[PDB]
């Protein structure tokens, strides 16, 4: 059977000093004892009768997508394309799914990386593995959401019971955003917020849907007057922005609205 001579693996049969060489199957897993290298089990990508095969660190022939000197090769199961043998690198092109993992094989019969447009959809294949990205992912300075199928998403997406927004380019949109004439506010992680936040224009109110008014969830509402929200007090002027410092209203009331947060810290009732 299979014996280890000096960190390298070999195969011998009953006669004595009968080194075997060539393809052998030791149970489930198949090996190749290189007749060039004294019958030593081949590790990594190796050429046998002009065909390419891949063996793990233990010398057993493997199937699937693997990094090569050429790029990502597909060492296909038997009869996958033009009656190929088990683990033979095939001249494959197109989409390829192997147990959830999705790959796209470019015209050179090798796995593609980064942005690839497939049909009318955008996909992002890992530069590390060649596998399509799924879910929320940072790609460069921006964040994108991809399907369970690796299709890049545009519009509002519910991720972990929070709303995110991906523009016409799939980018995640953070801060005070204009979405087709309506304004919304996203946290720096992308999560759409309700409350008053610091916008380029100043402090603005992004309100919950009200049955009257007819505002969308988290849509900027052109508020004016005092706002009592989340145990906080704000006053908005005709700018539909919250005021800071001292403010006295004809109703008697004298307020001090925190310079940093625009929230009421002091309220003296007068006449």
């Amino acid at each position, epitope marked *: 059977g299979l014996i280890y001579i000096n960190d390298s693996l070999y195969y011998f049969k009953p006669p004595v000093n009968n080194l075997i060489t060539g393809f052998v199957t030791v149970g489930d897993d198949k090996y190749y004892f290189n007749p060039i290298n004294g019958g030593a089990a081949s590790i990594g990508e190796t050429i046998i009768d002009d065909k390419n095969y891949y063996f793990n660190q233990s010398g057993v022939l493997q199937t699937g997508v693997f*990094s090569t*000197e050429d790029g990502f090769k597909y060492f296909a199961p038997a009869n996958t394309l033009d009656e190929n043998l088990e683990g033979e690198a095939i001249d494959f092109t197109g989409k390829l799914i192997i147990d959830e993992n999705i790959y796209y094989f470019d015209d050179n019969y090798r*796995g593609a990386v980064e942005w690839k447009e497939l049909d009318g959809e955008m996909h992002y294949f890992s530069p590390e593995t060649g596998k399509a990205f799924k879910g929320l992912n940072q790609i460069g300075d921006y964040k994108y959401y991809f399907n369970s199928d690796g299709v890049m998403q545009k519009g509002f997406v519910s991720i972990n019971d929070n709303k995110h927004y991906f523009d016409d380019s799939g980018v995640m949109k953070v801060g005070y955003t204009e979405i087709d004439g309506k304004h919304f506010y996203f946290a720096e992680n992308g999560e759409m917020q309700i409350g008053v936040f610091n916008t380029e224009d100043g402090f603005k109110y992004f309100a919950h849907h009200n049955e009257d008014l007819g505002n969308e969830e988290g849509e900027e509402i052109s508020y004016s007057g005092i706002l009592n929200f989340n145990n906080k007090i704000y006053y908005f002027d005709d700018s539909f922005t919250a005021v800071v410092g001292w403010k006295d209203l004809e109703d008697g009331s004298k307020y001090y609205f925190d310079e940093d947060t625009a929230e009421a810290y002091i309220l003296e009732h007068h006449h």
Partner: antibody
Amino acid sequence: EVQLVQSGAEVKKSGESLKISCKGSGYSFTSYWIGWVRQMPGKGLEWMGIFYPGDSSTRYSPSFQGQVTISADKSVNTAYLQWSSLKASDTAMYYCARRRNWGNAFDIWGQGTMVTVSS
Amino acid sequence: EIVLTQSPGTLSLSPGERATLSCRASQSVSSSYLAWYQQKPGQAPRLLIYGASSRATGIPDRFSGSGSGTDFTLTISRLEPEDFAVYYCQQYGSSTWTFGQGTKVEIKR
């Protein structure tokens, strides 16, 4: 950021032996092949060899086959180029460059290691 | 084997001008394996173009790559001061990587 940082400038006498390093940071070291390019003074670029950290597979230019050996991380997260008996003709700039996983272009380069070899 | 011959060797043009650099291969070659590198003096090479026409990360739009078969071209639509350097074209084939001898882009004055 993705970067390969190389060992300092080397001045060795002829026939001596040298091992030069290239530390990868900002990326998954085991996911990318890493290569060695020689730039003789005032001349262009010559490819020496490539190494795969996560397979340990190596392939050399027939012109560098035997004359040098490529290896990696010895735990974390460095590649190596070494000579057993240097020549004065080995005085050059040595670059290690990370390879893209389509279609073999070297996307990240090291600052370089100047290797000066004279008696 | 595969031999990359670049022309001119020196290209003297003034800032704002269009630069056209050539790379001719000794034999027909895959566009996937064609790359262009820029090397400023006393600095390391940097990737500009991969896969003959694709632009590497953070590479300005003035840099454009084209060609097929044996004739390849790097174009700089408008030369900026930083753009004056050496340009090497590269290819992979038959288990080995090959580089061009370079083209210097000098400032015409």
